[PDB]
Amino acid sequence: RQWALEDFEIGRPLGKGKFGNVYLAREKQSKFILALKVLFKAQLEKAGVEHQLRREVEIQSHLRHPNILRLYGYFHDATRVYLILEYAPLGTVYRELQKLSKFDEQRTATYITELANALSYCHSKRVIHRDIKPENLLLGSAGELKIADFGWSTLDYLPPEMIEGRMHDEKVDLWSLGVLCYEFLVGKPPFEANTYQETYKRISRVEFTFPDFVTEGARDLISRLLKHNPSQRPMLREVLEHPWITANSS
Amino acid sequence: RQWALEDFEIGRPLGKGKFGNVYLAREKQSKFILALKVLFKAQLEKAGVEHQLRREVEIQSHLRHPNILRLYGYFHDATRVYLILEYAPLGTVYRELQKLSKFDEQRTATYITELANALSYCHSKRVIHRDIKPENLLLGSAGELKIADFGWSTLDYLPPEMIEGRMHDEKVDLWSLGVLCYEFLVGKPPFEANTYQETYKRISRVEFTFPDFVTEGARDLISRLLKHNPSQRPMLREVLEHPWITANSS
Numbered sequence: 001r002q003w004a005l006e007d008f009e010i011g012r013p014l015g016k017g018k019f020g021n022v023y024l025a026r027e028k029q030s031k032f033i034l035a036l037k038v039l040f041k042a043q044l045e046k047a048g049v050e051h052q053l054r055r056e057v058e059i060q061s062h063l064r065h066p067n068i069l070r071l072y073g074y075f076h077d078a079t080r081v082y083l084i085l086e087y088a089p090l091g092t093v094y095r096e097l098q099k100l101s102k103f104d105e106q107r108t109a110t111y112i113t114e115l116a117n118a119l120s121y122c123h124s125k126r127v128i129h130r131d132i133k134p135e136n137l138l139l140g141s142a143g144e145l146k147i148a149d150f151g152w153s154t155l156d157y158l159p160p161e162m163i164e165g166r167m168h169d170e171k172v173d174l175w176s177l178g179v180l181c182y183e184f185l186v187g188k189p190p191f192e193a194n195t196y197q198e199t200y201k202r203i204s205r206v207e208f209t210f211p212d213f214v215t216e217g218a219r220d221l222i223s224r225l226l227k228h229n230p231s232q233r234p235m236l237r238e239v240l241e242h243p244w245i246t247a248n249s250s
Numbered sequence: 251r252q253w254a255l256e257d258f259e260i261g262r263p264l265g266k267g268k269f270g271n272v273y274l275a276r277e278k279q280s281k282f283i284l285a286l287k288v289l290f291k292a293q294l295e296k297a298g299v300e301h302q303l304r305r306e307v308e309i310q311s312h313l314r315h316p317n318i319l320r321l322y323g324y325f326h327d328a329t330r331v332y333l334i335l336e337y338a339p340l341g342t343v344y345r346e347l348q349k350l351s352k353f354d355e356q357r358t359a360t361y362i363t364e365l366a367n368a369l370s371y372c373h374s375k376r377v378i379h380r381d382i383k384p385e386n387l388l389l390g391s392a393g394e395l396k397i398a399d400f401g402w403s404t405l406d407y408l409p410p411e412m413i414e415g416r417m418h419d420e421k422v423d424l425w426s427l428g429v430l431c432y433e434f435l436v437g438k439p440p441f442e443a444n445t446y447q448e449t450y451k452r453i454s455r456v457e458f459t460f461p462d463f464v465t466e467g468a469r470d471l472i473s474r475l476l477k478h479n480p481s482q483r484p485m486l487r488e489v490l491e492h493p494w495i496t497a498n499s500s
């Protein structure tokens with residue numbers, strides 16, 4: 001059963017992205033609440049990322065996990081593309097982190113567990129993510145983490161393989177986890193800088209430090225994840241078993 | 251200065267491809283004879299290769315070499331894409347090879363030289379080719395070889411890196427040269443078979459033999475090119491210097 005814009009009542013804007021906004025919406029016939037992401041073809045085409053989107057939509061449609069935002073379907077009209085998405089009521093992790101400044105060890109451990117599980121499910125279907133940013137980590141009604149950026153296959157979140165033009169792997173997800181884990185605990189990502197040129201150098205040299213309040217256990221996990229060599233990074237299985245994770249996660 | 255279909259008089263079909271035909275055409279205002287390749291958007295989009303084409307057109311527009319078919323420009327209407335191409339009057343090498351059965355050493359050496367030069371120019375601009383088939387090797391008015399398949403970055407022409415799902419390189423062009431050189435001399439490519447499954451195995455094992463009429467010099471060149479390890483293949487510079495090439499090429 002195909003869709004069109006007239007099938008939905010559009011509510012307030014949830015976010016204004018670069019390629020278009022995502023709105024709250026309600027399917028008229030069923031009253032099913034959801035999110036509607038509205039993209040403009042001409043913009044996608046001029047940026048040269050329309051095919052990159054079609055692939056990402058193809059992958060997402062296959063993925064069912066409580067910590068991955070569902071793609072229900074999609075459609076288009078003369079000038080726009082529309083993605084019909086699950087609605088995450090509690091907003092972005094980014095906003096949560098701004099309000100709180102930083103997260104305690106149990107909230108962080110819990111989120112990393114949820115991410116590791118989601119990525120573990122993705123890994124078993126041979127799917128990776130370019131980038132996992134807090135702006136695309138959403139919260140379900142019970143506060144459950146939901147990955148909103150779509151799967152593949154500002155530099156802050158990119159691993160050295162990618163930025164240096166090296167050969168990337170399933171292991172980019174492990175770096176992502178280390179970046180997020182740090183950002184959750186200290187309130188900004190470990191390679192933050194005022195320029196791209198400097199953020200690049202820092203990612204490439206793996207040059208970061210920990211504030212004094214970051215405990216030994218978290219240091220150990222974060223350091224194991226943020227290895228320059230992707231092969232030196234652990235498997236997702238091992239992150240879920242790290243004593244700092246098991247001691248603190250739900 | 252943009253184009254449209256009304257700018258051209260369309261002549262007979264030069265070839266009927268999968269995604270559309272290429273026609274002889276004459277620009278009305280200038281009387282400039284050329285080839286017009288006509289593609290259907292909906293077909294490209296359904297096959298999922300529209301972006302692959304846009305990239306290939308972007309690369310080709312940059313390439314100027316007497317042995318690379320010129321792309322003059324392009325345009326589109328509601329349903330079609332149009333590529334404005336240089337006209338190669340003497341047709342495909344494939345047809346030439348069918349008429350002749352096989353080529354002598356001097357015609358072959360000459361063609362490989364022309365290909366090596368074209369690829370050498372492409373290599374210096376960091377461009378490769380997925381596949382170089384005789385069906386996409388065209389002939390200019392003086393019989394000069396022109397590469398018609400566009401640049402990147404039936405299995406007969408694909409190297410083992412690609413078919414095995416390995417990491418490919420600039421070195422795929424060297425394999426291509428070895429396949430063509432053989433096909434030119436014997437009149438069919440070295441891994442030909444009645445099935446894809448068998449052609450695959452043969453490419454992967456590098457399993458071919460030479461008819462008795464293929465001379466030592468040609469055996470030596472072809473064998474150096476068709477190495478399983480891409481790193482073991484020579485540089486284009488060395489192909490142009492091979493004694494069998496220099497002894498026989500124009």
Ligand SMILES: O=C(Nc1ccc(Nc2nc(Nc3ccc(O)cc3)ncc2F)cc1)c1ccccc1Cl
Binds near residue numbers: 091094095135
């Ligand atoms: O990425 C951002 N926002 C954002 C917003 C919506 C989406 N997509 C969806 N979001 C929502 N829920 C949501 C609820 C309340 C909010 O305030 C925000 C979101 N559900 C489904 C989505 F696809 C993705 C991302 C963002 C980026 C920079 C700064 C602040 C923010 Cl909130």
Ligand SMILES: O=C(Nc1ccc(Nc2nc(Nc3ccc(O)cc3)ncc2F)cc1)c1ccccc1Cl
Binds near residue numbers: 266272338388
């Ligand atoms: O690929 C084939 N043909 C083909 C035809 C045209 C193009 N494109 C252009 N060709 C031509 N010239 C040409 C002249 C006479 C001919 O009989 C054929 C071509 N110039 C420009 C092209 F873009 C590319 C390829 C082919 C494929 C299988 C069997 C036989 C053939 Cl002739």
